[PDB]
Amino acid sequence: GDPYWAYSGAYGPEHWVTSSVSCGGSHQSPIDILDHHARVYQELQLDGFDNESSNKTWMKNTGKTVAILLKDDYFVSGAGLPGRFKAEKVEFHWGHSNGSAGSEHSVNGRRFPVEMQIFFYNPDDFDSFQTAISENRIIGAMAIFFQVSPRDNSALDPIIHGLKGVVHHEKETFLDPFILRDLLPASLGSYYRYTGSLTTPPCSEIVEWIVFRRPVPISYHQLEAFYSIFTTEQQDHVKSVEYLRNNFRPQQALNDRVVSKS
Amino acid sequence: GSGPVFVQEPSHVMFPLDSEEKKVKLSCEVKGNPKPHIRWKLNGTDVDIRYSVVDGSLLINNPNKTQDAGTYQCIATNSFGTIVSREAKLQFAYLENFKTRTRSTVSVRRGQGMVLLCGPPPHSGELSYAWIFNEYPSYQDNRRFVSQETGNLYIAKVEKSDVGNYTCVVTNTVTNHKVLGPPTPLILRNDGVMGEYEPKIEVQFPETVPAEKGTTVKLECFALGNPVPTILWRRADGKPIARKARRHKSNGILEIPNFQQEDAGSYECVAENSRGKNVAKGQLTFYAQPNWVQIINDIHVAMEESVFWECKANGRPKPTYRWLKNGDPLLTRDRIQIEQGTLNITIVNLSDAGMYQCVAENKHGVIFSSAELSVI
Numbered sequence: 128g129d130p131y132w133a134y135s136g137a138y139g140p141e142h143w144v145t146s147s148v149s150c151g152g153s154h155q156s157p158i159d160i161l162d163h164h165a166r167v168y169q170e171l172q173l174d175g176f177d178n179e180s181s182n183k184t185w186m187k188n189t190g191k192t193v194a195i196l197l198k199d200d201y202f203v204s205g206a207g208l209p210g211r212f213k214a215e216k217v218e219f220h221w222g223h224s225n226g227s228a229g230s231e232h233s234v235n236g237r238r239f240p241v242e243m244q245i246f247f248y249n250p251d252d253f254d255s256f257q258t259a260i261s262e263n264r265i266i267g268a269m270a271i272f273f274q275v276s277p278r279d280n281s282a283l284d285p286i287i288h289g290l291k292g293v294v295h296h297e298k299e300t301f302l303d304p305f306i307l308r309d310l311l312p313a314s315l316g317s318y319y320r321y322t323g324s325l326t327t328p329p330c331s332e333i334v335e336w337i338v339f340r341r342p343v344p345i346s347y348h349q350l351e352a353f354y355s356i357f358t359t360e361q362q363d364h365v366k367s368v369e370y371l372r373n374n375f376r377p378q379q380a381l382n383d384r385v386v387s388k389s
Numbered sequence: 390g391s392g393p394v395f396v397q398e399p400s401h402v403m404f405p406l407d408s409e410e411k412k413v414k415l416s417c418e419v420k421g422n423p424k425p426h427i428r429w430k431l432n433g434t435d436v437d438i439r440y441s442v443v444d445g446s447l448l449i450n451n452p453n454k455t456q457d458a459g460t461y462q463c464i465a466t467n468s469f470g471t472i473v474s475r476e477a478k479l480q481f482a483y484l485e486n487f488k489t490r491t492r493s494t495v496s497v498r499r500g501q502g503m504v505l506l507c508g509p510p511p512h513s514g515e516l517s518y519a520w521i522f523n524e525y526p527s528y529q530d531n532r533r534f535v536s537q538e539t540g541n542l543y544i545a546k547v548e549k550s551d552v553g554n555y556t557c558v559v560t561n562t563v564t565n566h567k568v569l570g571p572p573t574p575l576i577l578r579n580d581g582v583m584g585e586y587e588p589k590i591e592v593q594f595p596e597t598v599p600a601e602k603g604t605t606v607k608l609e610c611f612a613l614g615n616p617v618p619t620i621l622w623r624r625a626d627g628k629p630i631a632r633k634a635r636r637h638k639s640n641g642i643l644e645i646p647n648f649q650q651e652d653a654g655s656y657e658c659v660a661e662n663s664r665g666k667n668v669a670k671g672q673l674t675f676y677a678q679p680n681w682v683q684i685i686n687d688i689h690v691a692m693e694e695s696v697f698w699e700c701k702a703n704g705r706p707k708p709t710y711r712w713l714k715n716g717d718p719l720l721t722r723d724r725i726q727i728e729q730g731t732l733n734i735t736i737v738n739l740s741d742a743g744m745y746q747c748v749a750e751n752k753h754g755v756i757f758s759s760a761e762l763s764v765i
């Protein structure tokens with residue numbers, strides 16, 4: 128029903144397939160995107176992304192990532208997506224120290240210290256994200272890279288502040304208001320599109336990915352907040368407190384798929 | 390000339406599953422003239438008699454948790470009317486052995502916080518817990534704590550001396566039976582030492598704690614952390630915790646014996662170290678099952694007289710009342726005024742003769758008092 132899995136160890140990514148057979152599929156995510164192989168679509172339109180987040184929006188340390196449960200209405204359309212998609216949550220992937228590789232996707236082999244993902248469902252076709260997941264319905268995902276910067280990105284302040292409040296597995300916190308738009312790259316023009324999967328079990332191959340080409344800046348000081356996060360792991364009859372680090376899935380084969388590039 | 394009177398009303402029965410008696414008894418001895426007939430209920434359905442019934446008492450040969458465990462009640466009837474018994478639970482108390490006889494070796498890093506999981510076997514009855522470390526009781530202190538709710542062993546910060554074998558010892562408090570689990574061998578993983586970090590409260594009491602009058606209520610709180618956290622208990626409202634309360638040596642359990650109203654309210658546990666603080670909070674809400682203060686007694690009255698009958702119970706929340714006549718709910722109607730724990734009959738007639746029961750109840754329990762109205 129929901130098998131144990133981790134980002135390393137006996138239940139690490141190489142082994143997910145043993146309990147979650149779809150992680151062995153041929154339409155898996157994430158991937159390295161080679162620009163020269165991507166083919167050349169309505170314009171990407173965001174709706175609601177500039178509105179201030181409400182005080183009900185909250186952040187949770189899930190043990191696998193830090194998640195932001197969105198409580199406002201944010202919608203995306205265009206970019207080949209079938210209809211309108213509404214945002215459900217945001218999740219993060221990071222390395223270990225010093226801006227080490229933390230992204231899931233890469234572009235021309237280039238990885239990034241963080242990857243932020245936003246997950247969407249079609250609110251018209253389905254009444255909730257969880258049902259969509261259930262029916263293996265199509266869901267939308269944006270991948271945004273963060274890139275090292277000499278000074279703090281103020282736009283990230285509320286998120287970094289929130290991280291400080293959820294150091295341990297299961298902690299939750301409300302966040303200071305933030306502008307979802309400002310966690311996306313300054314230029315939305317260049318992005319890639321392909322069909323792939325969840326990058327965690329059950330690895331369902333239902334994801335329309337929007338991978339933005341240009342990164343969002345983050346300082347080494349801000350990154351420290353990600354590296355300061357902990358999780359817990361299980362061994363036979365033991366639970367342990369562990370650093371939450373390098374929480375990314377290794378990359379997967381393209382196979383029959385092509386990447387589109389705006 | 391009398392309606393049924395309980396001589397031996399069903400009481401809770403604890404049967405030890407690994408007993409030697411192939412039989413359990415549920416009492417329902419009743420006296421009336423004429424002699425009453427008796428029926429049994431289980432989980433609200435009738436017991437259609439390997440069941441036996443002797444002098445009203447239900448005898449079960451070959452008791453079996455699956456078919457027999459549950460809530461019983463008897464109902465006694467003669468020509469003068471009917472009464473219903475209190476409910477009684479038949480409970481099979483047991484504790485199985487641990488199934489798997491084998492633990493994987495586990496490795497933890499010096500400085501790391503961890504929990505050794507008991508994983509107690511199927512059982513019925515309250516359990517208590519202890520661990521054995523390298524063949525000697527595992528010493529508890531600010532750094533090592535055993536939960537009596539989970540039975541887990543919490544180690545705030547692992548040190549080199551912790552290497553060795555750990556077995557969980559589980560005791561059924563009802564049968565006094567003890568079982569040992571397979572040892573889990575634990576070793577140091579020789580990567581670093583763990584860095585420092587905020588306490589993580591790893592076991593704690595619920596946000597809402599029903600706290601029964603007269604009982605001892607136990608609250609747990611323990612955190613993993615480097616440096617080892619301190620654990621502090623307080624009441625949110627600043628009042629001192631009662632001196633009768635006991636603290637476990639690791640400070641991981643606060644026990645409040647003989648619980649009384651003044652002991653209720655919001656409690657906090659603060660876990661702190663040089664890296665930060667976290668708090669568990671919860672409200673203890675006092676309650677008490679109903680207790681009889683005034684019962685109804687038999688009434689002998691003549692035609693056309695009137696009748697006022699009252700029962701009274703204490704409890705928290707304050708009990709409400711309802712009435713039965715011959716086992717059926719009795720509500721206000723012609724001549725008969727039913728108001729909470731009172732029954733007022735203006736002008737008695739022959740049809741009023743019967744058995745009556747005044748019932749007092751709250752969220753936490755229901756109690757019955759029974760008497761006969763007889764007319765002349």
Ligand SMILES: *[C@@H]1O[C@H](CO)[C@@H](O)[C@H](O)[C@H]1NC(C)=O
Nearest residue numbers: 406407451452453454455456
């Ligand atoms: C209880 O019933 C189950 C099947 O209902 C049976 O397998 C088991 O032997 C019984 N247990 C005892 C102790 O009689």
Ligand SMILES: *[C@@H]1O[C@H](CO)[C@@H](O)[C@H](O)[C@H]1NC(C)=O
Nearest residue numbers: 431432455456457458459460
């Ligand atoms: C009676 O009900 C209880 C649950 O309230 C259940 O545990 C038990 O197995 C039931 N007994 C029977 C006879 O089904």
Ligand SMILES: *[C@@H]1O[C@H](CO)[C@@H](O)[C@H](O)[C@H]1NC(C)=O
Nearest residue numbers: 523553554555572573574575
């Ligand atoms: C602990 O006990 C296990 C068997 O349970 C044994 O294999 C092991 O040698 C013991 N530890 C040491 C180092 O004595």
Ligand SMILES: *[C@@H]1O[C@H](CO)[C@@H](O)[C@H](O)[C@H]1NC(C)=O
Nearest residue numbers: 696697726731732733734735
């Ligand atoms: C009912 O009984 C009470 C006794 O407390 C009495 O005061 C009241 O008058 C009676 N009601 C009627 C309708 O006679």
